[PDB]
């Protein structure tokens, strides 16, 4: 199972949850999260944050009665994965190759938006410095 | 796509035949050879030979009116690709994964069959060595 293309695997998605806080008795059990495409991205801050393997929308603020499907459609209506209804081994390689192609795109988008924000930041920072020489 | 799984792609197989002699007017064009599962694995000592990427039978002695499917069905009936009638992107990732399972099998078979042939070889050298030491 080619490790680069593994996140299409719900069990792999489940395995990503290292010490995911919410378990039985909760509605966003990590199964329900992986079922929604999310994977665990624990950090120093917000160790509750997960990311959709396909659209890459990141999401925290998780409470036990949050429906990870409902939060995925809400914060990332454009996610193509949400539309996948068949199981993985049930996709034709035509469909699957279209997904991984779209997903790689979604990944460039995340990177592009990110470089752009990092740029505007250093942009804002330099004009402030220049403005200060007017004074 | 994962380079180990690239020979499943007809176009990839076609791309293999570099300096293949038989071209227009021939029955074993690199088109027909690839459609038949062959891949060009030429050597200095056998620049004619192609190998089925799936069952691993290798075949030289190619003449321009050879139909590589009929030469395939001939020398390796047990090859599972021959029964693959669907196009590639129409397989379910389930069936596709089943094939590569069998193909990995076929490669191990070839490995042992080869390890065995190497052994009977060095046996012969050892038997003939001993016999000469009788005289
Ligand atoms: Zn998504
Ligand atoms: Zn074959």
Residue numbers in the entry:
A (entry chain B), B (entry chain A): 6 to 140
Reproduce text from the manuscript describing this model.
In this work, we analysed continuous rotation (CR) and IBG collection methods for two different protein crystals (lysozyme and survivin) with different symmetry and resolution. We were interested in determining the best way of pairing anomalous reflections and whether or not structure-factor calculations based on a multivariate Bayesian model improve experimental phasing in practice.
Survivin is a small human protein of 16.5 kDa and is a member of the Inhibitor Apoptosis Protein (IAP) family involved in cell cycle division and in apoptosis. In the Baculovirus Inhibitor of Apoptosis (BIR) domain, a Zn2+ ion is coordinated by cysteine and histidine residues [Fig. 1(b)] and the wavelength was optimized for the element zinc in the anomalous X-ray diffraction experiment. While zinc has relatively strong anomalous signal at 9.66 keV, these crystals diffracted weakly, reaching only to 3.2 Å resolution. Survivin crystals are weakly diffracting and have lower symmetry, but they have potentially stronger anomalous signal due to the presence of Zn2+. They also have 69% solvent content, which tends to facilitate density modifications and SAD phasing. Survivin Friedel’s pairs are slightly less correlated in the IBG data than in the CR data, but this small difference can be attributed to the uneven sampling of the crystals with differing quality. Multivariate analysis of the same data consistently outperformed the univariate analysis. With weak data, exemplified by our survivin data sets, multivariate treatment of Friedel’s pairs may make the difference between a solved and unsolved structure.
